[PDB]
Amino acid sequence: SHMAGAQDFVPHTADLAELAAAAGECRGCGLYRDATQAVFGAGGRSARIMMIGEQPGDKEDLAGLPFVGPAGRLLDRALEAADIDRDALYVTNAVKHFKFTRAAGGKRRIAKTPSRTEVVACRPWLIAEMTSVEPDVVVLLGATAAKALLGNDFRVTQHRGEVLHVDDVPGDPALVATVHPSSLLRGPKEERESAFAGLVDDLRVAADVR
């Protein structure tokens, strides 16, 4: 069967503060139990560009805000190269509770890919955030966020660098699917620098869309 997920837990408000506090009470999937807190979005409803990642990392889970670690610094590098003010954005994630595993002698917490069940469970919060902010443009950072709004069969590589519209997205924002900043953290340097430049292209396009 198709799950209710977080729908039981989303209060009937468009206020981003009330939603974030309510999200700390969510039991829409299993991820609230081990995590410290919900990591809701950052920014205000006046934003015209919304950005969506995959899930919190270790430091996100401690801070309670998205993109505060290494991936967030690289994101800030990309936004600066695209002439975008981070505080003019609404930045969030498809999944709001840190999914992780502990380990014998490892890093304290190691992030684990959310399952599609968890992504669909958490999606009502994303819908609430888009209803709250009414973005004109939505940047989808990486495969998980893209599939969160475009469906489980969406392939980012098939649509890189296109401005899309979908039928189920509230307010009918333009959509730009692109690379996740964490992807620029490892790999061959050449590929990483060209990918960073491509991210910058997708951001400049997004900041230009009307």
The residues of the shown chain that bind ligand URA, judged by CB under 6 A, are 53-57, 60, 66-67, 71, 93, 182
Q: How far is the CB of 35 from ligand SF4 (least distance, A)?
A: 7
Q: Does 94 bind ligand SF4 (CB under 6 A)?
A: no
Distance between CA 91 and CA 72 in Å, rounded? 11
The answer to whether 95 contacts ligand SF4 (rule: CB under 6 A) is: yes
Q: Is 20 in the site for ligand SF4 (CB under 6 A)?
A: no
122 is in an annotated binding site: yes
User: Taking the complex as a whole, how short is the minimal distance between the CB of residue 54 and ligand URA, in angstroms?
Assistant: 3
Give the binding-site size for ligand SF4 (rule: CB under 6 A).
17
From 27-35, 76-84, 153-161, 184-192, give the range in contact with ligand SF4 by CB under 6 A.
27-35
Assess 26 for contact with ligand SF4 (CB under 6 A).
yes
Residue 145 binds ligand SF4 (CB under 6 A)? no
Six token digits for residue 168: 């189920």
Nearest one of 82, 89, 91, 86 to 203, comparing CA atoms: 82
For position 32 contacting ligand SF4 by CB under 6 A, the verdict is: yes
In angstroms, give the least distance from the CB of 167 to ligand SF4: 24
Sheet holding 174-178, edge to edge: 89-93, 49-53, 137-141, 174-178
Q: Does 10 bind ligand SF4 (CB under 6 A)?
A: no
Contact 103, 140 (CB under 8 A): no
- Which residue ranges are tagged as binding site for [4Fe-4S] cluster? 26, 29, 97, 122
